[PDB]
Amino acid sequence: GRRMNSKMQVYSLPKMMTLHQQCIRVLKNNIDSIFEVGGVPYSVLEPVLERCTPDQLYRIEEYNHVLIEETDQLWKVHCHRDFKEERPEEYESWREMYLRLQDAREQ
Amino acid sequence: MDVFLMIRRHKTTIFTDAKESSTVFELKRIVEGILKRPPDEQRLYKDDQLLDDGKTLGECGFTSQTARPQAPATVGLAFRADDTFEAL
């Protein structure tokens, strides 16, 4: 007495994915499962960090502290995505002003 | 189609690419021709199901999922006939 039950989103991964492409796309499907990358620079970690959310960036930056100075440009990627009507004043990195704006908004 | 068997001695590991039908000491002659392992230097520890004594690849225990491009069949080896059984 089993019930057959399944659905399908009709249409119309056929892609030559090499090593770096496979690694970045695996990370692009399991972003949130990273504890600490070790000593990886920003340039190789460029794409997956672009497809990422600021809570995950906060978790990474509090686990991988030494990377924050090379993440700040990406924070402008968040800033013009979320606080587009703003510009930082002098001596303002984007990460700390982004967190200041988030804390001010939730308060 | 292909064959994929981990010929793993600890500290020394050989790879396999061939078809779905092959003699088992043909692989020993292949690794002998380069890595210099004479036929004294093979013992062939057991696979998942009953490693073959009839000396052909198309038999019991060997299927098309063992020879997977995605995944290997990892097992230890021994480079002896009967003298010692050496791991690490």
Partner: protein, 101 residues
Amino acid sequence: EGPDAMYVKLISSDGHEFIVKREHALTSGTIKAMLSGPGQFAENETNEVNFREIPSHVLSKVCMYFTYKVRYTNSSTEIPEFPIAPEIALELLMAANFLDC
């Protein structure tokens, strides 16, 4: 490992080293700069890659992916992917630095 230019041995300064086919290592961008150094004609036959700090399962998977991709390069099959574990893929991103693939 020997004089014949069809097997290339490679070591990650650990126990379980791995020797992979040179014809299955063609897509490497660093095999044209390390094995093919200042000159061809018996630099490639040495097959002594004394690299460091790569875990055993990690370089096993990257050389499997080498032979996997080269056999799947220009082949009849075009769909498939490869199952790298999410933890080890982290250090396999380090491999994305060195193997140049």
